[PDB]
Amino acid sequence: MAPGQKECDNALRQLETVRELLENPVQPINDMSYFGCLDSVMENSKVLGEAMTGISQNAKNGNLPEFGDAIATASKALCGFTEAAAQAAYLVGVSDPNSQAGQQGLVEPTQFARANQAIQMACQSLGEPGCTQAQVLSAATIVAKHTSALCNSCRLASARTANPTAKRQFVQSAKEVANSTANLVKTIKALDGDFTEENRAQCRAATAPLLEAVDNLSAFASNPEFSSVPAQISPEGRAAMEPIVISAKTMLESAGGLIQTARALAVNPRDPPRWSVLAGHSRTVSDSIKKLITSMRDKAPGQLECETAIAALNSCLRDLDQASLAAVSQQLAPREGISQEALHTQMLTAVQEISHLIEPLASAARAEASQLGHKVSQMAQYFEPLTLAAVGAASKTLSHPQQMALLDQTKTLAESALQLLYTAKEAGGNPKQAAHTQYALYEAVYMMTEAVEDLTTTLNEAAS
């Protein structure tokens, strides 16, 4: 009854509905790439933060219309977070080696069912007698987005099909959905500088042919002939997606709590206990979002492999430090059963392989996230044979200064490789990371190139 209560009511329903995306992410949620998911959570963080400020201030000052605007904006941001979270979880799950992505059909029935549900909610909101101006706009924007998505999928489906009857039906259904929503859009435009009871009644009337067309499309699209095979996600994939899922669930739970409390406060703002409860939920919303973003970044393509490569390089560094400390106290035992020449050849071979991987690695770090993991693993693998050969070669180097110089120079190469790996992990193969990492990447490549040259020179002098 009271203004602002309906908005809180709709928000709670929207948060409960969007939570379903999190229960079993075995199909794509949308068309976003992993980097798109990350961008969306960053953008929604800003939007939700401002909306949360708006909720509190307008409940406190009794500005009920703008309180409803703030609840609506927060709900949209939270659904945004969840869609990005669920999509990220799906992409994580399928990319697992032991996981099998399901065959894509002509359409994804879950996306069709979701769109059907979002259109119903938006249409029912337009069918409300006490619906406001900014509520009509958000409901109108929802309808337009989901009907466009539905029509686009119908078009591609009637192009990818061999079945002539299905071809004609997807085209026909698209026509009906499009013609329906066009008729609704016109009635919504008629509201500008008018907004009368006679006109809101025009809009309500126009929703019925849309709902009917959408519900017909949904039925028809759920036929076994069209549906996708849900993916088979390994127990490991499930484990990797878990942090992302848990975080987004905690976000939704505490945001529900924030809204329930906000609802009472809008009615009676003179209530210190409830301000304390609202603040509690708010801090938990923020913590959950931080954990969600950090969880999602852990699972971007190439991130685990950078981490694994960095661990392997650090293991090589420990070996080199150990050999260096043994050398200075004359306690480095000479490597048995292999010659000085053969050990220098193993070093040169490894150094040449590392050298060839530098620029390819940087280009992946720069532009191609799908390559990065591989290049980082290839680079790191060569450091094990190099370290063993260098420790061996040093152990048999007759001059003490030269023995120490060989270890020092091998260490410098390893440390320059570490700096490149850390920089590549930051850039992550995301073209939009350029303005923050480009000069650091150039520096890291320069330092690596220099360290290769210096060690190669030493190895060339030893060959002479």
UniProtKB/Swiss-Prot annotation:
Localization terms from the record? Cell projection, Ruffle membrane; Cytoplasm, Cytoskeleton; Cell surface; Cell junction, Focal adhesion
The PTM N6-acetyllysine maps to K189
Where is the region Helical bundle R7B?
226-298
Residue ranges, annotated region (Helical bundle R8): 106-225
Spans annotated as Helical bundle R7A: 3-98
Ranges where the record places region Helical bundle R9:
300-464
Lineage, top-rank taxon, reads Eukaryota
Region Interaction with VCL and F-actin, residue ranges: 4-304
Region (Interaction with SYNM) location? 2-464
Assembly and partners are described as: Part of a complex composed of THSD1, PTK2/FAK1, TLN1 and VCL. Interacts with THSD1; this promotes interaction with PTK2/FAK1 and VCL. Interacts with NRAP and LAYN. Interacts with SYNM. Interacts with ITGB1; the interaction is prevented by competitive binding of ITGB1BP1. Binds with high affinity to VCL and with low affinity to integrins. Interacts with APBB1IP; this inhibits VCL binding. Interacts with PTK2/FAK1. Interacts with PIP5K1C. Interacts with F-actin. Interacts with SVEP1.
The role this protein plays is:
High molecular weight cytoskeletal protein concentrated at regions of cell-matrix and cell-cell contacts. Involved in connections of major cytoskeletal structures to the plasma membrane. With KANK1 co-organize the assembly of cortical microtubule stabilizing complexes (CMSCs) positioned to control microtubule-actin crosstalk at focal adhesions (FAs) rims.
Instruction: Tell me the domain comment.
Output: Consists of an N-terminal FERM domain linked via a short unstructured region to a large flexible C-terminal rod which contains 13 amphipathic helical bundles (R1-R13). The rod begins with a five-helix bundle (R1) followed by three four-helix bundles (R2-R4). These are followed by a series of eight five-helix bundles (R5-R7 and R9-R13) in which the N- and C-termini are positioned at opposite ends of the bundle, creating a linear chain. The four-helix bundle R8 does not disrupt the chain because it is inserted into a loop in the R7 five-helix bundle.
What name appears for this protein in its UniProt entry? Talin-1
Organism from which the protein derives: Mus musculus
Gene encoding this polypeptide?
Tln1
Q: Which residues of the full protein are shown?
A: 1357 to 1819 of 2541
